[PDB]
Design a binder for these strands. Structure first.
Ligand SMILES: [Mg+2]
Ligand SMILES: [Mg+2]
Ligand SMILES: [Mg+2]
Ligand SMILES: [Mg+2]
Ligand SMILES: [Mg+2]
Ligand SMILES: [Mg+2]
Lengths: 92, 129, 156, 199, 142, 86
RNA sequence: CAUGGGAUAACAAAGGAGCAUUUUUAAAGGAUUGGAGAUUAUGGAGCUGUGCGACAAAUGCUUUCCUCGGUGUGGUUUA
RNA sequence: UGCUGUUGCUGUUAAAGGGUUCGUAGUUGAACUGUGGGCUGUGCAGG
């Protein structure tokens, strides 16, 4: 994936948070540059995150895989529903 | 895979001599191959040869006169004390009158007659006649 | 004039944990030698000797505190006979290691060699810290146990 | 004297005639020339030698400089050698970096540790490259004659012939002087296909 | 080719004998090193970096201009891949094969090819552990 | 477990050691309290040996970096003096 | 068992960014005779840092990011 | 008796290549660090 390469880029060089609460926190400020959501997200939480992104004018990416796939892609050995990139590093 | 560069070179030379060629390309080359070729040259069994540099293991073009009957490598390179020369000549050479067993010794690579003159043993590399 | 050299130190628990008191047999650790025949860097009384054959006594033997009655440098165990080299194979035992002597054995009929190995149990003094794969020089001594006939003399 | 900054501090006390003349020429060039003005203030030489190539005319001025200036000298070698030749009539100038050679160890453990750039083959290759710098070696052969001798032939690009062929004899003799090895030169007009030019 | 199969293909590069860079290449060595590090910082492995420099910038060989190979430059700058590039690609292929086989349990040909890829991964990991290019206890997880 | 908890609270062992010894205690590695304590002491002794070796390594690193900085600074000074000689 | 030889080999190590200039003088600081052992102190040689002179350095600190002279029967080099 | 074969056997059809791969001990494993030079005399040296 393109998203996999960009994600590993930011895992090495940028900054991010994992989990919906920390993502929404970075969203409530302007620190977030991109929100990545697993296809596994429960509908109401997905909708809340989309609303926050729409209000903050933050780009939203819908991951193909579920929270397990997203967690593995981020190098993590746990699942993550929502990722927020707060510093893009040397990616884009 | 290729495991002995010397055996490959000597088999190539023997094939070219058997089929009556006047030149043969050897690939790859090494120092031991060059010393063996020089030993054969010193006794007139091959003519002039050229080492081509390719920034790798090089290549050799050997000019063949019709004098070489057969050259081959001995694998493994068996130990040979000064008292084993007669046995090797009996086993691998056409006669006691001509032909050479080539050895690697701590005095360098040479044929068996020169080594016996220096009173040194070593490992058997091959033969030619 | 002897009681003027008597000096009492305290028992340190890093050594004395055997239910019997650990001490060198060759010296009296309570009395200071007037001539400093057996004294370490820190003034403690410690016996040490030079084994022959040009083997240097390790600094930890001269100046350490370990008690080992089988150490060739600080006890009456002496080195005589064979000096062998080997690779350390196991360090699982207390003060004893297993070494391997790998060698080629020639079969005359086939004019070829065979890989063979022997294993020797060796006493290792606390003056050395050998690891698996290290090279060691060992020297033959009197029997120290059912299998041990050698002592570690140097760790490469 | 201002011009002696262009030598090693060792030779500034009692400079030889040729070393002082080369230092003077380098000092004047460090101001007159525009391309040599950008590099020469950091550059200085070790020694200068005269070599008389036999059976010919003209001598060869061998200028020795520290190896740390290799890139500096490479960057302006074509200008520097031409200007120095314009200074000395009837003499060729060849700039050779001073290189140290680590003799081949007799032990397999020391042999594994020697700096490969301090081996004889690498050093001799680099010295010959210095001698002919603007041209590069296009091929290399060793001719092994029936008498046990080995003769090395170095091939250059035939499009460079009109600039180097006249110097090739002096280069061969000076390479023999410095390395105690023989070298012969040939030209190839199609190096990719090993096409040797007969003239 | 030869390892794991009957392929005998010969296709490869033939590096030039004349190693000196062309005279029309007027990019200094330090600028080339900067380009290499910038490419690595955009998540490019040494193979891809070399290919961009060769296709778009006229740098036939980085080592011939700078004196150093690309992975050496990345190591000197802290940009080298955490695990070696070829092992990374083999692990990625094995993972994709396993993902495909999760749904396609009767694709026996892919199971055969997965066995070959994993044996390759173990032989390479053994090599890289021996030359201290990997940690001990580095484990390939299926 | 009560012993391991008390040792963690008093900082006698760190989290990694606590977790390892906890999983080994559940796995019937220690026969009694004194066995666990002796294993803890052995861990601490090996840790002290490693720490001493690493402290020597760090001292060499500091000394070598200092010598390097001094050599570089002296070379810069001498080059400046040579330039001022011109 | 001792020793000469080093060509062919083996063992071990490394995996090349944990890889790091020779000296001079100066100041600043922290065992030996002495009649011989003892004791008890000076006085040093011998440790870092501050200067200074003299060399070097396998890679440039004067850096790197902020028509004419020479050459073989035209070719370079400035113009 | 080269019908036990290291020297030194046989394996398409006479006896004998495992159905095919993978693979651990084992065995085996590519180049490279390297032409010493001058002086005189002497040799069917040779182009
Ligand atoms: Mg039969
Ligand atoms: Mg059959
Ligand atoms: Mg048959
Ligand atoms: Mg049959
Ligand atoms: Mg079957
Ligand atoms: Mg296999």
């Amino acid at each position: 994936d393109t998203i996999n390469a960009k994600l590993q880029l930011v895992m090495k060089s940028g900054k991010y948070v994992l989990g919906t609460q920390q993502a929404l926190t970075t969203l409530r400020q302007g620190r977030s540059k991109l929100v990545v959501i697993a296809n596994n997200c429960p509908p109401i939480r997905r909708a809340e995150v989309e609303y926050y992104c729409t209000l903050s004018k933050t780009p939203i990416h819908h991951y193909s895989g579920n929270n397990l796939d997203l967690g593995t892609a981020c190098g993590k050995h746990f699942r993550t529903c929502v990722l927020s990139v707060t510093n893009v590093g040397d990616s884009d | 895979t290729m495991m002995s560069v010397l055996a490959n070179a000597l088999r190539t030379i023997a094939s070219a001599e058997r089929r009556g060629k006047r030149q043969v390309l050897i690939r790859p080359s090494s120092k031991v191959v060059v010393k063996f070729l020089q030993v054969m040259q010193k006794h007139g069994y091959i003519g002039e040869f050229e080492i081509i540099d390719d920034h790798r293991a090089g290549k050799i073009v050997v000019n063949l006169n019709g004098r070489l009957n057969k050259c081959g490598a001995i694998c493994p390179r068996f130990d040979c004390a000064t008292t084993d020369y007669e046995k090797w000549m009996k086993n691998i050479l056409p006669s006691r009158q001509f032909g050479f067993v080539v050895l690697t010794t701590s005095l360098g690579i040479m044929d068996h007659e020169e080594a016996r003159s220096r009173n040194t043993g070593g490992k058997v590399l091959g033969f030619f006649y | 004039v002897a009681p003027q050299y008597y000096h009492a130190h305290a028992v340190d628990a890093t050594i004395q944990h055997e239910k019997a008191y650990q001490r060198q047999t060759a010296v009296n650790e309570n009395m200071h030698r007037p001539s400093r025949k057996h004294v370490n860097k820190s003034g403690h009384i410690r016996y040490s000797k030079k084994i022959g054959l040009g083997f240097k006594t390790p600094a930890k033997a001269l100046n350490g505190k370990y008690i080992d009655r089988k150490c060739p440098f600080t006890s009456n165990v002496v080195i005589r006979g064979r000096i062998l080299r080997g690779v350390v194979h196991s360090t699982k035992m207390h003060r004893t290691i297993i070494i391997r002597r790998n060698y080629l054995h020639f079969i005359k009929k086939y004019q070829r060699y065979q890989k063979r190995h022997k294993s020797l149990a060796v006493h290792c003094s606390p003056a050395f810290d050998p690891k698996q794969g290290d090279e060691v020089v060992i020297g033959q001594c009197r029997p120290l146990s059912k299998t041990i006939r050698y002592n570690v003399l140097e760790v490469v | 004297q201002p011009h002696l900054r262009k030598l090693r501090k060792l030779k500034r006390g009692k400079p030889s005639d040729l070393e002082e003349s080369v230092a003077k020429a380098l000092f004047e060039l460090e101001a007159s020339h525009k391309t040599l003005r950008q590099e020469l203030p950091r550059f200085h030489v070790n020694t200068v030698r005269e070599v008389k190539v036999p059976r010919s005319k003209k001598t060869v001025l061998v200028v020795f400089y520290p190896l740390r200036f290799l890139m500096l000298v490479r960057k302006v070698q074509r200008a520097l050698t031409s200007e120095l030749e314009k200074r000395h009539p009837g003499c060729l100038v060849m700039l050779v970096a001073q290189r140290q050679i680590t003799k081949r160890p007799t032990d397999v453990y020391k042999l594994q540790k020697v700096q490969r750039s301090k081996t004889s083959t690498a050093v001799f290759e680099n010295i010959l490259n210095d001698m002919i710098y603007p041209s590069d070696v296009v091929g290399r052969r060793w001719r092994c004659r029936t008498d046990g001798s080995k003769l090395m032939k170095v091939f250059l690009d035939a499009r460079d012939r009109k600039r180097i062929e006249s110097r090739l004899r002096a280069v061969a003799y000076v390479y023999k002087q410095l390395t105690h090895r023989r070298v012969s030169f040939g030209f190839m007009w199609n190096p990719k296909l090993q096409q040797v030019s007969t003239r | 080719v030869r390892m794991h199969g009957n392929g005998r293909g010969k296709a490869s590069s033939a590096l030039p004998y004349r190693r000196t860079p062309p005279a029309w290449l007027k990019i200094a060595s330090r600028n080339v090193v900067k380009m290499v590090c910038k490419s690595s910082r955009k998540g490019m492995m040494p193979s891809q970096i070399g290919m961009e420099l060769r296709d778009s910038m006229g740098i036939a060989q980085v080592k011939n201009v700078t004196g150093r190979k690309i992975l050496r430059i990345l190591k000197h700058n802290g940009l080298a891949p955490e695990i070696p590039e070829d092992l990374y690609f083999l692990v990625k292929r094995a993972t994709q094969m396993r993902k495909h086989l999760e749904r396609h349990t009767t694709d026996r040909d892919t199971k055969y090819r997965l066995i070959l890829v994993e044996s390759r991964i173990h032989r390479l990991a053994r090599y890289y552990k021996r030359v201290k290019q990997l940690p001990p206890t580095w484990k390939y997880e299926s | 477990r009560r012993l391991l908890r008390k040792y963690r609270a008093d900082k006698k062992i760190d989290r990694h050691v606590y977790r390892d010894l906890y999983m080994r205690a559940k796995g019937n590695v220690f026969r009694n309290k004194r066995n666990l304590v002796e294993h803890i002491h052995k861990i601490k002794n090996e840790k002290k040996k490693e720490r001493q070796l690493a402290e020597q390594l760090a001292a060499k690193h500091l000394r070598d970096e200092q010598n390097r900085n001094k050599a570089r600074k002296q070379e810069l000074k001498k080059r400046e003096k040579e330039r001022e000689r011109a």
